[PDB]
Amino acid sequence: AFDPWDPAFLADPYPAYADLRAKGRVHYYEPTNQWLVPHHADVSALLRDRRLGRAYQHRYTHEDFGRTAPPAEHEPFHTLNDHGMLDLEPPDHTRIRRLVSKAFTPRTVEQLKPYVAKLAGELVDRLVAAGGGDLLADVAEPLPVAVIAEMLGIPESDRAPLRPWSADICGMYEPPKDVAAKAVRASVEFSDYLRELIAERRKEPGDDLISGLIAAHDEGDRLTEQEMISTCVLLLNAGHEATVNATVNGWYALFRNPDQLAALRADHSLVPAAVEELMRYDTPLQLFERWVLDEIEIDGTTVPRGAEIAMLFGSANHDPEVFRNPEKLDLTREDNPHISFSAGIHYCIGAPLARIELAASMTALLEKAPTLGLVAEPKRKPNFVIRGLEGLSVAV
Ligand code: HEM
């Protein structure tokens, strides 16, 4: 009896998650032909199970897996997608991630802190100067793209087309004939830009990540041109909308919980714990899927090879067997093992950088806009897999 399109579910899905959890540990959903998993223990376990993957073609033809191959007109998208580590399974995943993690390191993250803090400060100053604005458009949206641009080493000169590129490519996962068109178009355009920067970095080495990707090697193993383009597009696409919606989701929760906002404003040392609790309370990434590569059993229920599982991260983050009073926002929550950055081999390689951007944004807002208030009830985007608002009207 579940309709993820119901406007009440889009407004507040957490009561329905409560019902799902109470009704069982795996539920077949005919409309999407998917098996829904809502408990934290099950989601955690399945993300670490070697019998599940974000791809199946390394093991089975589409046809042997009981599926239909995608249009060859979408080859440029599928090529760019299938060389990024998010949709790779071992041993290809292992190789590209071991290689990428030689260029993209803890030192790389540390080096961005000053630019993250600087940029955050500037953004909030401008909003303060205007005495208010749209937290999404003016503060949340600009920072993530800029940080990845900076890490990749791209001029503010040519940084304009990145958002619209990332937008149209991601449109493919949201699929209209028109969406598909721009998505392949952007996939080509963006990949050519990358292709270019890859060479003027080969004949002209730099200190950026594109240059660290060109250098990265191990056991004489190295990255292909496509693996590098795919990695760069993945880092922008993965590090943008999630970070944006965590900042706006967080501030909306803070405005709706004035006791917690006042606690935060009174003790800025809560910022790290606050970033984590606001993500558990209302994660922007509600849902992730896995193919069943070998038959599994969940709670004595057999899920067959060829099935697709939907992991409800939102449900898992409100599981009362893990969190006490999960429906309550508590920035001082001691016990917060939220799964928002996932688990197993696809565990977010960006999580340290994401946490530095969310902390820098929050600290700037608290220091520079300590009187910030919500002007209007925001409009919720009609989407149950990426949970977000159209914008956030604020005033000092
Ligand atoms: C609020 C911020 C973020 C959240 C909640 C988030 C969450 C996640 C999740 C859940 C996954 C795995 C999905 C799955 O298991 O199916 C993932 C993967 C990934 N994330 Fe993030 N992420 C965030 C920010 C970022 C940032 C800033 C970057 C990069 C700069 C990034 C890069 C990636 C990459 C490259 C992967 C693929 C990892 C792999 O497949 O091995 N993410 N992220």
Question: Describe it for me?
Answer:
The protein is an alpha+beta fold and 396 residues long. It has one domain: Cytochrome P450 (Cytochrome p450, Orthogonal Bundle), CATH 1.10.630.10. The protein is 51% helix and 9% strand. It contains 16 helices and ten strands. The chain has helices at residues 7-11, 14-23, 40-48, 75-82, 92-103, 106-129, 135-140, 142-152, 162-171, 177-202, 209-215, 225-256, 258-266, 271-281, 313-317, 351-368; strands at 27-29, 34-37, 52-53, 132-134, 287-292, 296-298, 301-303, 308-312, 373-374, 393-395. A five-stranded mixed sheet has the order 1-2-8-5-3, sandwiched between helices. A hairpin with a 2-residue loop joins strand 6 and strand 7. Helix 5 crosses helix 11 (209-215), helix 8 (142-152) packs antiparallel against helix 12 and helix 10 crosses helix 12. The structure holds protoporphyrin IX containing FE. The site of protoporphyrin IX containing FE has 25 residues, from helix 12 and helix 16.
Brief overview:
Helices cover 51% and strands 9% of the residues. The protein has 396 residues and is an alpha+beta fold.
Shape: globular
Rg from C-alpha positions?
A: 21 Å
Major sheet: 5 strands, mixed
Structural class: alpha+beta
Helix content: 40-55%
CATH architecture: Orthogonal Bundle
Order of helices and strands: HHEEHEHHHEHHHHHHHHEEEEHHEE
Number of strands: 10
Bound molecules: protoporphyrin IX containing FE
PDB class: oxidoreductase
Keywords: Cytochrome P450, monooxygenase, oxidoreductase
Assembly: monomeric
Entry title: Crystal structure of Cytochrome P450 107P2 from streptomyces avermitilis
